[PDB]
A paper describes a structure:
However, only low‐resolution structures have been reported for the full‐length protein, and thus the structural role of the C‐terminal half in self‐oligomerisation has remained elusive. In this study, we determined the solution structure of the human [name] protein by cryo‐electron microscopy (cryo‐EM), at an average resolution of 3.5 Å. The structure revealed an undecameric ring that is nearly identical to the crystal structures of the N‐terminal half. The cryo‐EM map for the C‐terminal half was poorly defined, indicating that the region is intrinsically disordered. The present cryo‐EM structure provides important insights into the mechanistic roles played by the N‐terminal and C‐terminal halves of [name] during DNA double‐strand break repair.
The human [name] protein, which forms an oligomeric ring structure, is involved in DNA double‐strand break repair. The N‐terminal half of [name] is primarily responsible for self‐oligomerisation and DNA binding.
Author numbering:
A (entry chain D), B (entry chain E), C (entry chain F), D (entry chain G), E (entry chain H), F (entry chain I), ...: 25 to 208
Amino acid sequence: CFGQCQYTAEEYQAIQKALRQRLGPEYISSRMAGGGQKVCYIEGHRVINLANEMFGYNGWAHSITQQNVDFVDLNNGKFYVGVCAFVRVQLKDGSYHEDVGYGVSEGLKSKALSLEKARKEAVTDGLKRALRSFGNALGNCILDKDYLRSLNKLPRQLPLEVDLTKAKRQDLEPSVEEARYNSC
Amino acid sequence: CFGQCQYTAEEYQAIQKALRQRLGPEYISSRMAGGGQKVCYIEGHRVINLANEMFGYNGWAHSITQQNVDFVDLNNGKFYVGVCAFVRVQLKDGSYHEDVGYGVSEGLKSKALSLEKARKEAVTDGLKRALRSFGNALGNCILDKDYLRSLNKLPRQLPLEVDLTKAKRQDLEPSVEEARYNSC
Amino acid sequence: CFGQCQYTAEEYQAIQKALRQRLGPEYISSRMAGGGQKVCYIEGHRVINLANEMFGYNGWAHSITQQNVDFVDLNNGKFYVGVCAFVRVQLKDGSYHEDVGYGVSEGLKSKALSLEKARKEAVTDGLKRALRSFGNALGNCILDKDYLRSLNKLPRQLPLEVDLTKAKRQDLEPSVEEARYNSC
Amino acid sequence: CFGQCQYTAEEYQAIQKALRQRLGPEYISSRMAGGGQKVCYIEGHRVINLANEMFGYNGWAHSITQQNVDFVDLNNGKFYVGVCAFVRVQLKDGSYHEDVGYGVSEGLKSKALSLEKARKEAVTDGLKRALRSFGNALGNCILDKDYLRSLNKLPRQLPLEVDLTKAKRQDLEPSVEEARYNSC
Amino acid sequence: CFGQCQYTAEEYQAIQKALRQRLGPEYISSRMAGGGQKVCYIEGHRVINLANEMFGYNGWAHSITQQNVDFVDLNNGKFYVGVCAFVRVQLKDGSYHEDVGYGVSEGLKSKALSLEKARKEAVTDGLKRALRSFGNALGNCILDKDYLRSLNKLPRQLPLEVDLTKAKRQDLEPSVEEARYNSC
Amino acid sequence: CFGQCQYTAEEYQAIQKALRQRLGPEYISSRMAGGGQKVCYIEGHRVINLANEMFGYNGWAHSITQQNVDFVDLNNGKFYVGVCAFVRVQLKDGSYHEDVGYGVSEGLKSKALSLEKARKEAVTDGLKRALRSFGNALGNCILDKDYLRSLNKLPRQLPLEVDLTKAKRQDLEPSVEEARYNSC
Amino acid sequence: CFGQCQYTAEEYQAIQKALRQRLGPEYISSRMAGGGQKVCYIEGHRVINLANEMFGYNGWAHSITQQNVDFVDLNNGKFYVGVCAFVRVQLKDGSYHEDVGYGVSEGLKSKALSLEKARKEAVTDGLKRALRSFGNALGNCILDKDYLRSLNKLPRQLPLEVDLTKAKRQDLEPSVEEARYNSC
Amino acid sequence: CFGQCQYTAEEYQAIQKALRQRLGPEYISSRMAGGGQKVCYIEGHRVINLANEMFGYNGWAHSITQQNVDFVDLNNGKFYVGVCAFVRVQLKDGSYHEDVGYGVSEGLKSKALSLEKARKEAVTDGLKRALRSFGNALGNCILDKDYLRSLNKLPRQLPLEVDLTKAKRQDLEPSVEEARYNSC
Amino acid sequence: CFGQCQYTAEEYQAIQKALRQRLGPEYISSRMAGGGQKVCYIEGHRVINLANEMFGYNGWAHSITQQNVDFVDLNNGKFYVGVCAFVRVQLKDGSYHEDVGYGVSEGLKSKALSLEKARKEAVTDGLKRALRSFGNALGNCILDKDYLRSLNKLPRQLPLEVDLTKAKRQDLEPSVEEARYNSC
Amino acid sequence: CFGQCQYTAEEYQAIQKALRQRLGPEYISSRMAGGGQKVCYIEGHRVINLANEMFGYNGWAHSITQQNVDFVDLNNGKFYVGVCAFVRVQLKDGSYHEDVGYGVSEGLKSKALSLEKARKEAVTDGLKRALRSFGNALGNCILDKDYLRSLNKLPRQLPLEVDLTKAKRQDLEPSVEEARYNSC
Amino acid sequence: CFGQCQYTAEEYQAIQKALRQRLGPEYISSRMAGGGQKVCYIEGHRVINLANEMFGYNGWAHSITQQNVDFVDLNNGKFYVGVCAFVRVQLKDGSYHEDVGYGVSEGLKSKALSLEKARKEAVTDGLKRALRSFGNALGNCILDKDYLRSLNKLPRQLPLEVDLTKAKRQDLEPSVEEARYNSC
């Protein structure tokens, strides 16, 4: 089952070589840090799809080992919420990587929305930081300074328009059900 | 049993390819956020059916690892309830994904109804966010900005009328019972 | 034993296809919500029989993982009781689904009756919401808005009179005892 | 041992078909609810015998997972006692069903008798509600409204006189001891 | 060992048929309830011998899962003691039944004697109520109203005088020791 | 080892038949209850020897599952000590019986002696009550009223003088050591 | 290993027959009870040697399951210490017996010596009372009243002088070391 | 799986020889310590890539065994946060190394950002210090004084510009998916 | 390994016969008890060597199951320290013996030295009392009164001078290393 | 895996002989103790490399079993921090050694830096003291007084300049990757 | 692995005979006890090397089962620290010995240094006292009074000068690495 299967040599080399390279300009987005320069990051769904495409959708898993609210402060009617989360990512071979993410809320008035934002963000950057440890292709290169400098010297590409003419419009999946029938 | 069976190659490719694409305009609904623009989301039962159709009704499971009431506040006779829930979704191969959902209640007067809404919603978006990690087909594409922009440029389709002439009107299931007899 | 047997292909397809469709007008009942429109729901015993008929009487199980009284308030001599319950439903293959139900009591004067109602209702809607996740046939369709709209356009069928001429009037079960003898 | 043996096909169909039907007029008794109409129920020993006859005396078990006194109140010299009990019923195949029962005492003066009544009744309706989930024959039909309406249109049968000429008057069991000798 | 051996078909039918019938007039005794009619019950040793004779002396076991003193009150120099006990009875096949018994003391002056009576009685009716669930022969019929009415219409038999000419007067057991020698 | 060996048919019948009968006049002794009639009981060592002779010295075991001091009260310089003990007796086949005994001290001045008496007596009647459940021969018949009435109509036998000419006067056991040598 | 080996038939009969008889006048010693008659007992080392000679030095074990100081009181400069100890004795076949011993100190001035005496005595009579349960030869007969009466009618034998000409004067054990060499 | 596979001789010698040497001038960076000289260190991603390249991306894992906030102090409106983290690095053969890292924040005003920095840095230097123990190539040489002195005598190389013409611009990985297909 | 090997017959008889006899005058030393006569005891190292010589250096083990300081009192500048220790001695066959030792300090001024003495002595007499249970040769005979009386009638032997010409003066052990080489 | 492999005879003798000798003048460094003479010690990385070279990089592991801050004192604006750490070093054969190290900080003003220094130093000398127990080659000889005296009589060798022309300048490891490919 | 291998006969006799003798004058050192005579002891590293040479470097292990600070007192500016440590030494056959050591500090001013000394010394004499139990060669003879008296009558040998011409001056171990290669 999970955490027991042994990677084959061809699969090992494929995944290692694929993880060796860096990301392209489409993945990295930017934010305006408070009292700082432009901070480059990667969207959560981009890294998620990268994971399901590199290790397989059934090849990697992530769990929240422990999450606790660090603080909820009420200052002049605003809620400052800080939350930490421990996220562990495990492959199908048994390897794993555990890292901490932080969720921060400072502007919202409603306490419930503040905790919602804080906990969801804590989990999402926990996942990001835990997947970063597996190689450059999953998001390590964002921390490299020379890589960011080279990125700054690239043309600003326009966002791609999604061609959805072949999207999912009917529920029944004849191919998937047929394959599962052949597997049963 | 569950969490032990190994996915076959044909089934693996079928589910991976099916999870690769995005959702169609029928799945995404909209809400009017308080002091915000239109927020797009997916209904819970849509994602549930997507799960039972992609992995099989017996292929995926979800459990509530931990749920705790964050706060219940009484302000001038109204109840503000905020609840967090940890939901873990596991496939039949052993892979899993754990995520946090939040339930919020702010308008209801009765405390019992407020907690009912908060806990049920916390579990439902916990399930949604935990299933989002498995691919674009299960709801990841809702977070993509370009995908939403493309969706905004689509015609507004009328809701489909359900043809229920072949609904379930008798309890006895001759086909299911016969198949189970042949299996016993 | 339970949670270990593997579903056969024929049984898998039978149960999947049976779970794919929706329910008929006989199952859904209605309630008059306080300060609201007609709220449609499904009776507990209907869903129970649906479970024993779809998965077999020995094919599904449910347990109360955790139940705790959220609040018991005494307001001007009335008891407001709110209770939450965690219910886990497991099939014979190992798959499972866990969900939360709420029990509410607001009118009864006696505390004991209020807790009785609250806990029993909490468990019953916990079972309902946990069985809802297995497909449309077990009660998912109640949440679909288009399905409810189509239901509203149906004739109001009169309740069926139960023909009990073949009810259980003697204790001794010659068929069951004979079959168990042949099995021993 | 218990919870490990697999049901045979013939036994499975026998028990399923036997559980499919409903109960006869002899089983259901009535009570006069406080400020209400006639409430129909089933006696505990009737359901107990139904269990030992349907699944075998060694085929089903029940345990009290957790019982706690909800409240003991002293009002003007009377004791109001409310108790909850969690009862789990398990078959010899491993299937199980867990449900909550409530015991209520409001008239008795002595505290000890009040707790005796409350706890015993809590366990007995816990057993009833946990056995109800296995099918219509074990007591599910009591909750069906149309079934009760049909029952109201039946003649009121006189209670049966027990013919005890073949009761147990001697301790020694030659048949049972001989069978156990042949089994040893 | 215990809880692992499988009952044979002949033994199963013997014990089931023996448990099917009811008890004779010798077993049931009567008590004068405080402010009530005659309450019929069964002596503890009668049920104990019934157990060792029906399932074998090595075929059934009972344990006290949990016992706690509910209350010890001192009223004007008298001790009111109420105790609850959870008793679990298990057969050699693994089946089990768990039930609650209550011990009550209200007249004794000495606290130690009151607790002695309360705890011993709690355990004894715990055993009685736990053995009641196995069938009519072990004491279920005491709760049947028609059975009690039929019992009231029976002649009052005089208590039997025990013929003890073949009692145990010497310690050494040549038969038992010889059989154990042949078994070793 | 202990709790695993299976009783043979001949041994089973020997022990069952031996346990079926009642005790002789030598075993039962009498005490003068405070403000009561003559209370009949059995000495601890008598029951102990009965156990080692019926099941073998290596065939039965007893353990103290839990013992707690119920109360130690100081009244006008006297110590009233009440102690409860849970004793579990297990055979070599795995069967067991658990029961509660009480130790009482009310006259002694020294606290240490009072607790000594209370705890030792609690354990000894715990053992007695736990062994009572195995049959009439081990002490069940003491609770039978007709048996006691028949005992009252018996001649009062003089206590037997022990013939100790063949007592144990030398430590070395040539027979036991030789048998153990042959077993090694 | 320990608690797993099965006793052979010859060894079983040897140990049973040896345990059947009673002790000789040399073993029982006497004490002058405070405000009482002569109390007969057995020395600890006598019972210890009896154990190592009956079951073998490697055939029996004893452990202190739980020991707690009941009370340490300071009265006018004297220390009254009462201690209880739970001692479990286990044979090599798996059988066991657990019993409570009490240690008492009332005259000593130093607290440390009082606890030393109390705990050591508690353990020693715990061992005595736990070994008493295995038969008459290990010390059960001390509780028999007729046995003590017969003992009182015996001549008072002078204590035996130990002939130590063959005592242990050199450390090296050629026989034991040679046997262990042959065993290795 | 992980922690079970045995390293081969050729792989063992390869990794040992590779770990024997020291790092080149590109890896070590410098910081200006407060009131101190230039402090040399290694970037986190450099060591991460070194780990995935030396032991394989699936050959090493790291987990956070325990992390606790040492202190959060508020001094004149600034937050001094000190956090410790225990990080354990394990190879695929079972070997492991556990070490402590510290995260420090002293300048930031917002508490949430201070804890974010402190915890993330604590984990990152925990990983660094835990990987340092495996050899000189993974970062041990930074602590050698003579190595640092030799480094100071080296020319200051300009940072390398990353050639990203072959970066990751499309999601689909034909090579990885094909290899996984061949492995399934 | 330890606690699993079975003693051979020759080894069993050798150790049993060796343990049967008593100790010689060299082992027993004397102390002047406070306000008492001469108290005879055995030195710790003597008993230790006796253990390693009787059961082998690898044949017996001892562990401190639990040690707790009973009291540390400060009286007029002196420290009275009383400590208890539970010591368990286990043979290589699985047999064991557990006993309590006490450490006492009353004269020392420094607290640290007092606890040092108390704990070390508690452990040493715990070991002595736990080894006493294995037979007369390991120190049981010290408690025999007739043995001590016979010892008093013996000539007072002068202490033996140790001939150390063949002591250990070089570290390297050619014999031990050669034997271990032959064993590897 | 780790802690299971058995050392071979040749490897055992190699490691034993290598551990037998002492260290050379290059390893030992000196410190100026406060109010003391020159204190000789060994650098952490030296001992680390000695470990990876003697037992192999995959042959030894170390873990922090428990670390707790002993004290953090604020004296006139300075922070005195004392920390203890328990470090366990285990070989691949299962052998282990556990020892305590202490971290001390007394001069630093910032609390965070003080704890950083204290905990890191505590772990590093815990590792040193735990590795010292394996032989003279890993650092035992530092405690020998005659060895230190002989060291003082040696010429003061100049520190060696590291020849880094063959350092690690490229990430890709063709040899390691090729060996791992051949191992997969 | 460790604690499982069985000692061979030749190895057993070698180690037993080697442990039988006593130590030579080089091992024992002396200290000037406060207000006492010369106290003889053994250095820690001497006993450590004795252990690795007698049982092998991989043949014995030691662990700190539990260590707790007994007291830290501040008297007029000096720190009196007393610490106890439980040390367990285990051989490769499974045998073990557990003993307590004490660390004392009374002169140092700094608290951190006092705890450092106390804990390190506690562990070191815990190791010494735990290794003492294995025989005379590992340090038992230090407690023998006649052995010490004989030692006092020996000439005072000058400390040996260490010949370090063959010390460890290069890291690479060709012999050890070659042997490990042959073992892999």
